Amino acid sequence: EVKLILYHWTHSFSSQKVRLVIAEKALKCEEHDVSLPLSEHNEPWFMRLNVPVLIHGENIICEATQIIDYLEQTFLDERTPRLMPDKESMYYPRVQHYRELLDSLPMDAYTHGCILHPELTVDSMIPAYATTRIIAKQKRLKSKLLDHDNVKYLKKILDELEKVLDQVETELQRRNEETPEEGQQPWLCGESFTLADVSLAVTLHRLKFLGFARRNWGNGKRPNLETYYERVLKRKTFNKVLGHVNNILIS
Amino acid sequence: EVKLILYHWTHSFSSQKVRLVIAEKALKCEEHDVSLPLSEHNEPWFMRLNVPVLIHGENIICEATQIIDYLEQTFLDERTPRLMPDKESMYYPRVQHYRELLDSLPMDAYTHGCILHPELTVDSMIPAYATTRIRSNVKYLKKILDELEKVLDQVETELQRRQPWLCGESFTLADVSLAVTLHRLKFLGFARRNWNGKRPNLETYYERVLKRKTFNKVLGHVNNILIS
């Protein structure tokens, strides 16, 4: 067969979505984790949060959204699951809507703003010493201003994250209303696991890692979202691909 | 050792710049031509003239302009030739200009203006049955071609002020962009239209790189439609 080759960083947010798609679609892929256990400065992966590429025959595709679009387009065997409904379907506008809504979130800024200013996280899974590493009065006020602006920005996107999850919460509430409690529960947009679901699951898993989870769900807040998360953690594909991607004890 | 991997199409314009940079820097690279001789629609490589990627240890770099930048920044061993002067040197601001101006040429438009509207081509190396196949505007084509006349006008004058190469004594990244660019223009048939009675020092510049050891090794026969 025409080999599928993927170069990626095991712990990068974009890599996680690609590898999960490959697993949802049951595709055979020669996956190369180019990341090292120890860096040139002898630092583990959780201290280095800062694009993947697919080679399939004559095609070379970079960036995760493009790779996944390529996979959904080219692997059309009847046994291969589709993660998107047909373009002429009732459901396509809704799946593409939430997929874009979640793929638009500034995850890089959430992680950068977690290492810096960890006082806005709760139960962050990154060690606290990651924050410590990362006359002249002109500079004393210079750096105070950059901190003031960096926080004003971080707080702003965290408020924008809440409003995105509010829609997801409301959407998941519509599914809970439409589904008997005794029976198979649907996913975000329907009975089928879609690309909107991989973007949501991987996003939530990372917000958990950054300590931005208790702020947004749990202890009565967004119960449908909490249920959705504890469920995808049990999903066989998710656990195999991402089961221990938040475990800083594993290299 | 840390391996240097490149996935590329041999006959891609951008890939040619990358592979030439690698050879000009004397870097051991495992290069994978992922292109096939015949497509599923049974077309040779000169029909499908419609991004490369470099893997180096923990690094993955895609677009060609970025691959070349990564190579110039990373392999700083004294035995590795530099294709770019220091960023605070007197000579950097000019090399970057010609580099950006050459890298800004619409090579995709030229190629499709060669297949289509072959009347504006002279000694096009693409067989004529590509024009018949692809047909199943000349206004915009003549425009970008005349824009090219103006860009080449700048290159001709810089060559008078000079053996050395385009910007200075050493072979630089402005040279690969110029060399690979001209070489493609010849393939497309736009070589006589722009230089025997016109642009003499450029004709000497183009004829000189063709004899260059490294250029001939990597691009000696990228214009030969008989080779896959």
Read off the CATH number of the domain in which B204 is found: 1.20.1050.10
- Gap between the Cα atoms of A210 and A111, Å rounded: 6
**Same domain, yes or no, for A132 and A234?**
yes
**Same domain, yes or no, for A13 and A40?**
yes
- Domain total for chain A? 2
Query: Which tokens is A178 given?
Result: 């439409």
DSSP class of residue A216 equals T
Amino acid at B56: H
- Gap between the Cα atoms of A210 and A123, Å rounded: 8
User: How many Å separate Cα A222 from the centre of its chain?
Assistant: 18
Say if CB A216 and CB A161 are below 8 A apart: yes
Q: Touching check for B9 and chain A: CB below 8 Å?
A: yes
Structural domain includes residue B83: no
- Give contacts of A62 with chain B, Cβ < 8 Å: 51, 53, 60, 62
- Gap between the Cα atoms of B211 and B220, Å rounded: 9
**Same domain, yes or no, for B113 and B203?**
yes
In which element (H, E) is residue A118 found?
none
- Gap between the Cα atoms of A29 and A7, Å rounded: 10
**CATH code: domain of residue A50:** 3.40.30.10
Q: What CA dihedral angle connects A67, A71, A74 and A78, to 10 degrees?
A: 180
Q: Which residues pair with A5 in a beta bridge?
A: A30, A55
Q: Cβ B55–A34 below 8 Å, yes or no?
A: yes
Which residues in chain A (34-93) have CB-CB distances under 8 A to chain B? 34-36, 51-53, 55, 57-60, 62
- Gap between the Cα atoms of B49 and B37, Å rounded: 13
Range A119-122 contact pairs with CB under 8 angstroms and sequence separation of 24 or more: A120/A154, A120/A155, A120/A158, A121/A210, A121/A211, A121/A212, A121/A215, A122/A211, A122/A212, A122/A213, A122/A214, A122/A215
Measure CB to CB from residue B34 to each of A35, A57, A62 and give the nearest one: A57
Q: Determine the angle formed by the axes of helices A13-24 and A107-115, rounding to 10 degrees.
A: 130
- Gap between the Cα atoms of B116 and B49, Å rounded: 12
CA distance A156 to chain B (A): 32
- Gap between the Cα atoms of B24 and B19, Å rounded: 9
Chain A residue closest in CA terms to B5? A7
Structural domain includes residue A38: yes
CA distance A145 to chain B (A): 30
Give the domain range for residue B12.
4-74
**Same domain, yes or no, for B119 and B171?**
yes
- Gap between the Cα atoms of B66 and B74, Å rounded: 12
Structural domain includes residue A223: yes
**Same domain, yes or no, for A65 and A155?**
no
Say if CB B17 and CB B222 are below 8 A apart: no
Report, in angstroms and rounded to the nearest whole number, the Rg of chain A calculated over CA atoms. 20
| Residue A26, phi-psi category: left (phi > 0), alpha (psi -120 to 50), beta (remainder) | left
User: How many Å separate Cα A12 from the centre of its chain?
Assistant: 9
Query: Which tokens is B116 given?
Result: 């289509």
Structural domain includes residue A248: no
- Gap between the Cα atoms of A199 and A225, Å rounded: 14
Q: What CA dihedral angle connects B50, B56, B61 and B63, to 10 degrees?
A: -30
For B114, half-sphere exposure in the C-beta direction (CA atoms, 13 angstrom radius) is 27
Query: Which tokens is A47 given?
Result: 């201290």
In what order do the strands lie in the sheet containing B53-56? B30-33, B4-8, B53-56, B59-61
Chain A to chain B Cβ contacts (< 8 Å): 43
Say if CB A223 and CB A42 are below 8 A apart: no
Beta strand A30-33 with A4-8: parallel, antiparallel or unpaired? parallel
For B60, half-sphere exposure in the C-beta direction (CA atoms, 13 angstrom radius) is 21
Alpha helices for A104-194 (secondary structure H)? 107-115, 129-133, 137-178
Q: For residues B134-147, b (16+ Cβ closer than 10 Å) or e, as one string?
A: eeeeeeebeeebee
Q: What CA dihedral angle connects B209, B215, B216 and B220, to 10 degrees?
A: -100
**Same domain, yes or no, for B147 and B51?**
no
Query: Which tokens is A173 given?
Result: 């509430």
**Same domain, yes or no, for A10 and A73?**
yes
Choosing from A83, A99, A116, the residue where a domain stops is: A83
Q: Which residue has the tokens 């696991």?
A: A193
Q: What CA dihedral angle connects B121, B127, B132 and B134, to 10 degrees?
A: -90
Q: Which residue has the tokens 């490294």?
A: B214
Which structural technique was applied? X-ray
Resolution attained, angstroms: 2.8
Q: Which residue has the tokens 């990358």?
A: B18
Choosing from A59, A83, A107, the residue where a domain stops is: A83
Measure CB to CB from residue A60 to each of B34, B57, B59 and give the nearest one: B34
Structural domain includes residue A251: no
- Gap between the Cα atoms of B152 and B143, Å rounded: 14
CB-neighbour burial class of residue A196 (10 A; exposed 0-12, middle 13-18, buried 19+): buried
- Gap between the Cα atoms of B155 and B99, Å rounded: 11
Q: Determine the angle formed by the axes of helices A195-209 and A107-115, rounding to 10 degrees.
A: 10
Q: Cβ B62–A51 below 8 Å, yes or no?
A: yes
Choosing from B40, B74, B108, the residue where a domain stops is: B74
Q: Is B7 helix (H, G, I), strand (E, B) or coil?
A: strand
**Same domain, yes or no, for B97 and B69?**
no
Say if CB A75 and CB A85 are below 8 A apart: no
**Same domain, yes or no, for B56 and B99?**
no
- Give contacts of A35 with chain B, Cβ < 8 Å: 58
- Give contacts of B9 with chain A, Cβ < 8 Å: 58
- Spell out the SS3 assignment of B20-76: HHHHHCCCCCEEEECCCCCCCCCCCCCCCCCCCEEEECCEEECCHHHHHHHHHHHCC
**Same domain, yes or no, for A4 and A125?**
no
**Same domain, yes or no, for A28 and A102?**
no
For A196, half-sphere exposure in the C-beta direction (CA atoms, 13 angstrom radius) is 25
The number of residues making up chain B comes to 228
Structural domain includes residue A153: yes
Say if CB B223 and CB B183 are below 8 A apart: yes
**Same domain, yes or no, for B188 and B116?**
yes
Say if CB A110 and CB A95 are below 8 A apart: no
DSSP class of residue B9 equals -
The number of residues making up chain A comes to 251
Structural domain includes residue A247: no
Measure CB to CB from residue A55 to each of B7, B36, B59 and give the nearest one: B7
- Sign of the Cα pseudo-torsion (B160, B165, B166, B167, in order): negative
- Gap between the Cα atoms of B16 and B30, Å rounded: 15
In what order do the strands lie in the sheet containing A59-62? A30-33, A4-8, A53-56, A59-62
Structural domain includes residue B82: no
Q: Which residues pair with B54 in a beta bridge?
A: B6, B61
For B152, half-sphere exposure in the C-beta direction (CA atoms, 13 angstrom radius) is 23
